[PDB]
Amino acid sequence: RKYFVAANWKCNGTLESIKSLTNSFNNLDFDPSKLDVVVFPVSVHYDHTRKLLQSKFSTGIQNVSKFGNGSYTGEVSAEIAKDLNIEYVIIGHFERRKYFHETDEDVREKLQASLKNNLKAVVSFGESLEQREQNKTIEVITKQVKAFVDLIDNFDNVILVYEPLWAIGTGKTATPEQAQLVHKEIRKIVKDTCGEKQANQIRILYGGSVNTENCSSLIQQEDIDGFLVGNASLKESFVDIIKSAM
């Protein structure tokens, strides 16, 4: 298991601010055969971003269509991404499930499209504060992971991300012990449905207010293999979060 650190810029950036930020990220000396680091700019920033980042950084887009090419105004198909040599996609992010009504079935259809078209997928899921307070966290996560887990065929090319919804953008980070408990269950699902070797190969990242202060204690946990990072990835100090995985 290679550790994996991903910057989700969400809906942020200007041409100038991406030049300044990618310059800082390029100054970090790391070996991309030892750690995957991926940046996810806004779609219209993808070209600018890929041009500026050195190739040690992988790139991807923040969403991909559940449909293939055709009459889907506004959508970007996995086929189109493949032809732009876009390497990664994020699927299942809380913001898409929340504001745009994306369902588990949408997530399954997007992963199917992504794998069919040679895209690697960062697939996110997690329980709300209400579900956690009803003591339903593992049941929720188990249902969300089983919505798509049978589609995975190469266990290096799908990366799972546990982001409890209450930790996203709030500063209320899960503790390393809370994250680990859930990651151990996610890995156990993959073991059950896919086999032990596959479960030991797959990366399971944590996300939900990861920052420079708390990242080392999270990644030290046995079943936490890196991070999907939102607000902290817009800052030049994001390099220190990469360093925690080095």
Counting the structural domains of the chain, the total is: 1
Domain residues for 16? 1-246
Around Cβ 153, how many Cβ atoms within 10 Å?
A: 10
List Cβ neighbours of 160 (8 Å cut-off, separation of 6 or more).
123, 125, 145, 186, 190, 202, 203, 204, 205
Q: Dihedral through CA 109, CA 110, CA 115, CA 116, nearest 10?
A: 60
Domain with residue 166: its CATH number is 3.20.20.70
Work out the burial of residue 126: count CB atoms within 10 Å of its CB; fewer than 13 is exposed, 13-18 middle, 19 or more buried.
Answer: buried
Angle (CA) 131-101-69 rounded to 5° is 140
Report the candidate in 220, 215, 223, 221 with the shortest Cα–Cα distance to residue 239.
215
Q: Are 132 and 152 in contact (CB under 8 A)?
A: no
169 is in an annotated binding site: yes
13 is in an annotated binding site: no
234 is in an annotated binding site: no
In whole angstroms, give the CA distance from residue 159 to residue 152: 10
Q: Are 58 and 38 in contact (CB under 8 A)?
A: yes
228 is in an annotated binding site: yes
207 is in an annotated binding site: no
Q: Which residues does the annotation mark as catalytic?
A: 93, 163
| Residue 197 identity (one-letter amino acid) | K
In this structure, the strands spanning 120-125 and 158-162 are parallel
Report the first-to-last Cα separation within the chain, whole angstroms.
13
Q: How was this structure determined?
A: X-ray
SS (H, E, C) 92-106: CCHHHHHHCCCCHHH
DSSP β-bridge partners for residue 158: 121
70 is in an annotated binding site: no
Angle (CA) 15-17-21 rounded to 5° is 120
In whole angstroms, give the CA distance from residue 27 to residue 163: 29
